[PDB]
Each structure stands twice: as C-alpha cells, then as structure tokens.
C-alpha cells in the first residue's frame, strides 16, 4: 500500500526514493535510466521500485 522503508534483501533504504522516481519518469526517462540516476545497482533493490503498486492513493478518496 505504501513504499517499504527498507529493501527486503539488502537492507538499503528505499522509502525516500518514490517521489523522486515518479519525478524522473515524469519528464522523459526510461525506467532503466531513472533507476540508475538514483543509485540502485543491485537487481534486488531495483525490484523494489520497479514492481510497486501504490494503493494508498486510492484509500484517500473515502471521506473520514
């Protein structure tokens, strides 16, 4: 539902890279280049962002 704070395998901190990732895909970057501009070089830390579905933005549509 929300980006995890740590990669499950390494332990590297990922939870602070979701808004910057959307910002790079916003302009023209490919997913392969945006992930390199952030410093994710092991394929266990790239799976974290490449395969994340953000469900928290759809539970904010229901009035509290």
């Amino acid at each position: 539902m929300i980006i995890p704070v740590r990669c499950f395998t390494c332990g590297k901190i990922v939870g602070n890279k979701w808004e910057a990732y959307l910002g790079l895909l916003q302009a023209e970057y490919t997913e392969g280049d945006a992930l390199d501009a952030l410093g994710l070089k092991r394929y266990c830390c790239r799976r974290m962002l490449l395969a994340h579905v953000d469900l928290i933005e759809k539970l904010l549509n229901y009035a509290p």
Binding site: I2, I3, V5, I13, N16, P64
Partner: peptide, 13 residues
Amino acid sequence: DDILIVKLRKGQE
C-alpha cells in the same frame, strides 16, 4: 529527502 510515514486527508490526525 524525508521518509514517508502516512498520508492524511482533510479531517484526520
């Protein structure tokens, strides 16, 4: 940057 914890809607705390 800043680690995200939760997002809130108008009227939540």
